């Protein structure tokens, strides 16, 4: 009986530890959600610079087509 | 568009033959219309004389 009183005290300490672990795991997952948001923002910035490469790539090809002229209308696209 | 339409439309080269046939048939159609117009004119002249 008194030994079992000490046993339940051990279990009390264990439960306190477990509660802290549970709280920490919840906080961990919360941080993962926040992390995912920031990573999405990063990818957005990368997409922006991909747009920049699209600009210069079209520039280069447009010039090369004019530069490679070795033997029209004005219809273009103006968003 | 110069070289672009050149290569593209040259590959379209078989399609355009039908367009040529269209224009030729349009000419033949109005030619038969001219024949009918001549028939009407001569009809008016002969009937008025009668």
Coordinates of N, CA and C in Angstrom, one line a residue:
Chain A
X1 N 0.8 -1.2 0.0 CA 0.0 0.0 0.0 C 0.8 1.3 0.0
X2 N 1.7 1.5 1.0 CA 2.5 2.7 0.9 C 3.5 2.7 -0.2
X3 N 4.0 1.5 -0.6 CA 4.8 1.4 -1.8 C 4.0 1.8 -3.0
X4 N 2.8 1.5 -3.0 CA 1.9 1.8 -4.1 C 1.6 3.3 -4.1
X5 N 1.6 4.0 -2.9 CA 1.5 5.4 -2.8 C 2.6 6.0 -3.6
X6 N 3.8 5.5 -3.3 CA 5.0 6.0 -4.0 C 4.9 5.7 -5.5
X7 N 4.3 4.6 -5.9 CA 4.1 4.2 -7.3 C 3.2 5.3 -8.0
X8 N 2.1 5.6 -7.3 CA 1.2 6.6 -7.9 C 1.9 8.0 -8.0
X9 N 2.8 8.2 -7.1 CA 3.6 9.5 -7.2 C 4.5 9.5 -8.4
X10 N 5.1 8.3 -8.7 CA 5.9 8.1 -9.9 C 5.0 8.4 -11.1
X11 N 3.8 7.8 -11.1 CA 2.9 8.0 -12.2 C 2.5 9.4 -12.4
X12 N 2.4 10.1 -11.3 CA 2.0 11.5 -11.3 C 3.1 12.3 -12.1
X13 N 4.4 12.1 -11.7 CA 5.5 12.7 -12.4 C 5.5 12.4 -13.9
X14 N 5.2 11.1 -14.2 CA 5.2 10.6 -15.6 C 4.1 11.3 -16.3
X15 N 2.9 11.5 -15.7 CA 1.8 12.2 -16.4 C 2.1 13.6 -16.6
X16 N 2.8 14.3 -15.7 CA 3.2 15.7 -15.9 C 4.1 15.8 -17.1
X17 N 5.1 14.9 -17.2 CA 6.0 14.8 -18.3 C 5.2 14.6 -19.6
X18 N 4.3 13.7 -19.6 CA 3.5 13.4 -20.8 C 2.7 14.6 -21.2
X19 N 2.1 15.3 -20.3 CA 1.3 16.5 -20.6 C 2.2 17.5 -21.3
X20 N 3.4 17.7 -20.8 CA 4.3 18.6 -21.4 C 4.7 18.2 -22.8
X21 N 4.9 16.9 -22.9 CA 5.2 16.3 -24.3 C 4.1 16.6 -25.2
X22 N 2.9 16.4 -24.8 CA 1.7 16.6 -25.6 C 1.6 18.0 -26.1
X23 N 1.8 19.0 -25.1 CA 1.8 20.4 -25.4 C 2.9 20.7 -26.5
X24 N 4.1 20.2 -26.3 CA 5.2 20.4 -27.2 C 4.9 19.9 -28.6
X25 N 4.3 18.7 -28.6 CA 3.9 18.1 -30.0 C 2.9 19.0 -30.7
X26 N 2.0 19.5 -30.0 CA 1.0 20.4 -30.6 C 1.7 21.7 -31.1
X27 N 2.6 22.2 -30.3 CA 3.4 23.4 -30.7 C 4.2 23.1 -31.9
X28 N 4.7 21.9 -32.0 CA 5.6 21.5 -33.1 C 4.8 21.5 -34.4
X29 N 3.6 20.9 -34.4 CA 2.7 20.9 -35.6 C 2.3 22.3 -36.0
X30 N 2.1 23.1 -35.0 CA 1.8 24.5 -35.3 C 2.9 25.2 -36.0
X31 N 4.1 24.9 -35.6 CA 5.3 25.5 -36.3 C 5.4 24.9 -37.7
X32 N 5.0 23.7 -37.9 CA 5.1 23.1 -39.2 C 4.1 23.8 -40.1
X33 N 2.9 24.2 -39.6 CA 1.9 24.9 -40.4 C 2.5 26.3 -40.8
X34 N 3.1 27.0 -39.8 CA 3.7 28.3 -40.1 C 4.8 28.2 -41.1
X35 N 5.6 27.1 -41.0 CA 6.7 26.8 -41.9 C 6.2 26.7 -43.3
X36 N 5.1 26.0 -43.5 CA 4.5 25.8 -44.8 C 4.1 27.1 -45.4
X37 N 3.6 28.0 -44.6 CA 3.2 29.3 -45.1 C 4.4 30.1 -45.6
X38 N 5.4 30.1 -44.8 CA 6.6 30.8 -45.3 C 7.3 30.2 -46.5
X39 N 7.3 28.9 -46.6 CA 7.8 28.2 -47.8 C 7.0 28.6 -49.0
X40 N 5.7 28.7 -48.8 CA 4.8 29.1 -49.9 C 5.2 30.5 -50.4
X41 N 5.5 31.4 -49.4 CA 5.9 32.7 -49.8 C 7.2 32.7 -50.6
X42 N 8.1 31.8 -50.2 CA 9.4 31.7 -50.8 C 9.2 31.3 -52.3
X43 N 8.4 30.3 -52.5 CA 8.1 29.8 -53.8 C 7.5 30.9 -54.7
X44 N 6.7 31.8 -54.0 CA 6.1 32.9 -54.8 C 7.1 33.8 -55.3
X45 N 8.1 34.1 -54.4 CA 9.2 35.0 -54.9 C 10.0 34.3 -56.0
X46 N 10.2 33.0 -55.9 CA 10.9 32.3 -57.0 C 10.2 32.4 -58.3
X47 N 8.8 32.3 -58.2 CA 8.0 32.4 -59.4 C 8.2 33.7 -60.0
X48 N 8.3 34.8 -59.2 CA 8.5 36.1 -59.7 C 9.8 36.2 -60.5
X49 N 10.8 35.6 -60.0 CA 12.1 35.7 -60.7 C 12.0 34.8 -61.9
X50 N 11.2 33.8 -61.9 CA 11.0 33.0 -63.1 C 10.4 33.8 -64.2
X51 N 9.5 34.7 -63.8 CA 8.9 35.7 -64.7 C 10.0 36.5 -65.4
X52 N 10.9 36.9 -64.5 CA 12.1 37.7 -65.0 C 12.8 37.0 -66.1
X53 N 13.1 35.7 -65.9 CA 13.8 34.9 -66.9 C 13.0 34.8 -68.2
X54 N 11.6 34.8 -68.0 CA 10.8 34.7 -69.2 C 10.9 36.0 -70.0
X55 N 11.1 37.1 -69.3 CA 11.3 38.4 -70.0 C 12.6 38.3 -70.9
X56 N 13.7 38.0 -70.2 CA 14.9 38.0 -71.0 C 15.0 36.9 -72.0
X57 N 14.3 35.8 -71.7 CA 14.4 34.7 -72.7 C 13.7 35.1 -74.0
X58 N 12.5 35.7 -73.8 CA 11.8 36.2 -75.0 C 12.6 37.3 -75.7
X59 N 13.3 38.1 -74.9 CA 14.2 39.1 -75.5 C 15.2 38.5 -76.4
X60 N 15.9 37.6 -75.9 CA 17.0 36.9 -76.6 C 16.5 36.3 -77.9
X61 N 15.4 35.5 -77.8 CA 14.9 34.8 -78.9 C 14.4 35.8 -80.0
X62 N 13.8 36.9 -79.5 CA 13.2 37.9 -80.4 C 14.4 38.6 -81.2
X63 N 15.5 38.8 -80.5 CA 16.6 39.5 -81.2 C 17.2 38.5 -82.1
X64 N 17.5 37.3 -81.7 CA 18.1 36.3 -82.5 C 17.3 36.1 -83.8
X65 N 16.0 36.1 -83.7 CA 15.2 36.0 -85.0 C 15.5 37.2 -85.9
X66 N 15.6 38.4 -85.3 CA 15.9 39.5 -86.1 C 17.4 39.5 -86.6
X67 N 18.2 39.0 -85.7 CA 19.7 39.0 -86.0 C 20.0 37.9 -87.0
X68 N 19.2 36.8 -87.0 CA 19.4 35.7 -88.0 C 18.8 35.9 -89.3
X69 N 18.3 37.2 -89.7 CA 17.7 37.4 -90.9 C 18.7 37.2 -92.1
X70 N 18.5 36.2 -92.9 CA 19.3 35.8 -94.0 C 18.4 35.4 -95.1
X71 N 17.8 36.2 -95.9 CA 16.9 35.7 -97.0 C 17.7 35.2 -98.1
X72 N 6.8 42.4 -92.2 CA 5.4 42.0 -92.2 C 4.5 43.0 -91.6
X73 N 3.3 42.5 -91.1 CA 2.3 43.3 -90.4 C 2.9 43.8 -89.1
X74 N 2.0 44.5 -88.3 CA 2.3 45.0 -87.0 C 1.5 44.4 -85.9
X75 N 0.8 43.2 -86.2 CA 0.0 42.6 -85.3 C 0.8 42.0 -84.2
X76 N 0.5 42.4 -82.9 CA 1.2 42.0 -81.7 C 0.2 41.8 -80.6
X77 N 0.7 41.6 -79.4 CA -0.1 41.4 -78.2 C 0.3 42.4 -77.2
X78 N -0.6 43.2 -76.8 CA -0.3 44.3 -75.8 C -1.2 44.1 -74.6
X79 N -0.9 43.3 -73.6 CA -1.8 43.1 -72.4 C -2.0 44.4 -71.6
Chain B
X1 N 6.8 37.2 -88.3 CA 5.7 36.8 -89.1 C 6.1 36.5 -90.6
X2 N 7.2 37.1 -91.1 CA 7.7 36.8 -92.5 C 8.0 35.4 -92.6
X3 N 9.1 35.0 -92.0 CA 9.5 33.6 -92.1 C 8.5 32.6 -91.5
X4 N 7.8 33.1 -90.4 CA 6.8 32.3 -89.8 C 5.7 31.9 -90.7
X5 N 5.1 32.9 -91.3 CA 4.0 32.6 -92.3 C 4.5 32.0 -93.5
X6 N 5.8 32.2 -93.9 CA 6.4 31.6 -95.1 C 6.4 30.1 -94.9
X7 N 7.1 29.6 -93.8 CA 7.1 28.2 -93.6 C 5.8 27.6 -93.3
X8 N 5.0 28.2 -92.4 CA 3.6 27.7 -92.1 C 2.7 27.6 -93.3
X9 N 2.5 28.7 -94.0 CA 1.6 28.8 -95.1 C 2.1 27.9 -96.3
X10 N 3.4 27.7 -96.4 CA 3.9 26.9 -97.4 C 3.5 25.4 -97.1
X11 N 3.6 25.1 -95.8 CA 3.1 23.8 -95.4 C 1.6 23.7 -95.6
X12 N 0.9 24.8 -95.5 CA -0.6 24.8 -95.8 C -0.8 24.7 -97.3
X13 N 0.2 24.8 -98.2 CA 0.2 24.6 -99.6 C -0.9 23.7 -100.2
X14 N -1.2 22.6 -99.6 CA -2.3 21.7 -100.2 C -3.7 22.3 -99.9
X15 N -3.9 23.0 -98.8 CA -5.2 23.6 -98.5 C -5.6 24.6 -99.5
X16 N -4.6 25.5 -99.8 CA -4.9 26.6 -100.7 C -5.4 26.2 -102.1
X17 N -5.1 25.0 -102.5 CA -5.6 24.6 -103.8 C -7.1 24.6 -103.8
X18 N -7.8 24.3 -102.7 CA -9.2 24.3 -102.6 C -9.7 25.8 -102.7
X19 N -8.9 26.7 -102.1 CA -9.3 28.1 -102.2 C -9.2 28.6 -103.6
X20 N -8.2 28.1 -104.4 CA -8.1 28.4 -105.8 C -9.3 27.9 -106.5
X21 N -9.7 26.7 -106.2 CA -10.9 26.1 -106.8 C -12.2 26.9 -106.4
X22 N -12.2 27.4 -105.2 CA -13.3 28.3 -104.8 C -13.4 29.5 -105.7
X23 N -12.3 30.2 -105.8 CA -12.3 31.4 -106.6 C -12.6 31.1 -108.1
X24 N -12.1 30.0 -108.6 CA -12.5 29.6 -110.0 C -13.9 29.3 -110.2
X25 N -14.5 28.7 -109.2 CA -16.0 28.4 -109.2 C -16.8 29.6 -109.1
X26 N -16.3 30.6 -108.3 CA -17.0 31.9 -108.2 C -17.0 32.6 -109.5
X27 N -15.9 32.5 -110.3 CA -15.8 33.1 -111.6 C -16.8 32.4 -112.5
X28 N -16.8 31.1 -112.5 CA -17.8 30.4 -113.4 C -19.2 30.7 -113.0
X29 N -19.5 30.8 -111.7 CA -20.8 31.1 -111.3 C -21.3 32.5 -111.8
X30 N -20.5 33.5 -111.6 CA -20.9 34.8 -112.2 C -20.9 34.8 -113.7
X31 N -20.1 33.9 -114.3 CA -20.1 33.8 -115.8 C -21.5 33.3 -116.2
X32 N -22.0 32.3 -115.5 CA -23.3 31.8 -115.9 C -24.4 32.8 -115.6
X33 N -24.1 33.7 -114.5 CA -25.0 34.7 -114.2 C -25.0 35.8 -115.4
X34 N -23.9 36.0 -116.0 CA -23.8 36.9 -117.1 C -24.5 36.4 -118.3
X35 N -24.5 35.0 -118.4 CA -25.2 34.4 -119.5 C -26.7 34.6 -119.3
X36 N -27.2 34.4 -118.0 CA -28.6 34.6 -117.7 C -29.0 36.1 -117.9
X37 N -28.1 37.0 -117.6 CA -28.3 38.4 -117.8 C -28.5 38.8 -119.3
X38 N -27.6 38.1 -120.1 CA -27.7 38.3 -121.5 C -29.1 37.8 -122.0
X39 N -29.5 36.6 -121.5 CA -30.7 36.0 -121.8 C -31.9 36.9 -121.5
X40 N -31.8 37.6 -120.3 CA -32.9 38.5 -119.9 C -32.9 39.7 -120.8
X41 N -31.7 40.3 -121.2 CA -31.6 41.4 -122.0 C -32.2 41.2 -123.4
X42 N -31.8 40.1 -124.0 CA -32.3 39.7 -125.3 C -33.8 39.4 -125.2
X43 N -34.2 38.8 -124.1 CA -35.7 38.5 -123.9 C -36.5 39.8 -123.9
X44 N -36.0 40.8 -123.1 CA -36.7 42.1 -123.1 C -36.7 42.7 -124.4
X45 N -35.6 42.7 -125.2 CA -35.6 43.3 -126.5 C -36.6 42.6 -127.5
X46 N -36.5 41.3 -127.5 CA -37.4 40.5 -128.4 C -38.9 40.7 -128.0
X47 N -39.2 40.6 -126.7 CA -40.6 40.7 -126.3 C -41.1 42.1 -126.5
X48 N -40.2 43.2 -126.3 CA -40.7 44.5 -126.5 C -40.9 44.8 -128.0
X49 N -40.1 44.2 -128.9 CA -40.3 44.3 -130.3 C -41.6 43.6 -130.7
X50 N -41.9 42.4 -130.1 CA -43.1 41.7 -130.4 C -44.3 42.5 -130.0

